[PDB]
From Swiss-Prot:
The Tudor domain 2 mediates reading of dimethyl-lysine residues. The Tudor domain 1 doesn't bind dimethyl-lysine residues, due to an atypical and occluded aromatic cage. Expressed in heart, kidney, liver, lung, pancreas, placenta, spleen and testis. Not expressed in brain, skeletal muscle, colon, ovary, prostate, small intestine and thymus. Expressed in colon and ovary cancer cell lines while it is not expressed in the respective normal tissues. Antibodies against PHF20 are present in sera from patients with hepatocellular carcinoma, glioblastoma and childhood medulloblastula. Ubiquitinated by TRIM26; leading to proteasomal degradation. The gene is PHF20. Residues 4-69 form the Tudor domain. It comes from Homo sapiens. It is found in: Nucleus. Homodimer; disulfide-linked. Component of some MLL1/MLL complex, at least composed of the core components KMT2A/MLL1, ASH2L, HCFC1, WDR5 and RBBP5, as well as the facultative components BACC1, CHD8, E2F6, HSP70, INO80C, KANSL1, LAS1L, MAX, MCRS1, MGA, KAT8/MOF, PELP1, PHF20, PRP31, RING2, RUVB1/TIP49A, RUVB2/TIP49B, SENP3, TAF1, TAF4, TAF6, TAF7, TAF9 and TEX10. Component of the NSL complex at least composed of MOF/KAT8, KANSL1, KANSL2, KANSL3, MCRS1, PHF20, OGT1/OGT, WDR5 and HCFC1. Methyllysine-binding protein, component of the MOF histone acetyltransferase protein complex. Not required for maintaining the global histone H4 'Lys-16' acetylation (H4K16ac) levels or locus specific histone acetylation, but instead works downstream in transcriptional regulation of MOF target genes. As part of the NSL complex it may be involved in acetylation of nucleosomal histone H4 on several lysine residues. Contributes to methyllysine-dependent p53/TP53 stabilization and up-regulation after DNA damage. This is PHD finger protein 20.
Length: 69
């Protein structure tokens, strides 16, 4: 019952792909897609250099994801 990833300009939904995301404190940082959950339509975000215990799942339609550019 996979759902289909959206088509978003400047974002590739692949493991290892780069983008920017806003953390819980509402700051944007560069990030990489660690995993993609086709089941629930989410992506595990790893912020560069962070301890991986701080990785966060984001709905892939999330406004708090955006391209590197």
């Amino acid at each position: 019952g996979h759902m289909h990833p959206p088509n978003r300009r400047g974002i590739s939904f692949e493991v290892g792909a780069q983008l920017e995301a806003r953390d819980r404190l509402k700051n944007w940082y560069p990030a990489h897609i660690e995993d993609i959950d086709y089941e629930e339509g989410k992506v595990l975000i790893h912020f560069k250099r962070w301890n991986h215990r701080y990785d966060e799942w984001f709905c892939w339609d999330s406004p708090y994801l955006r391209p590197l550019e």
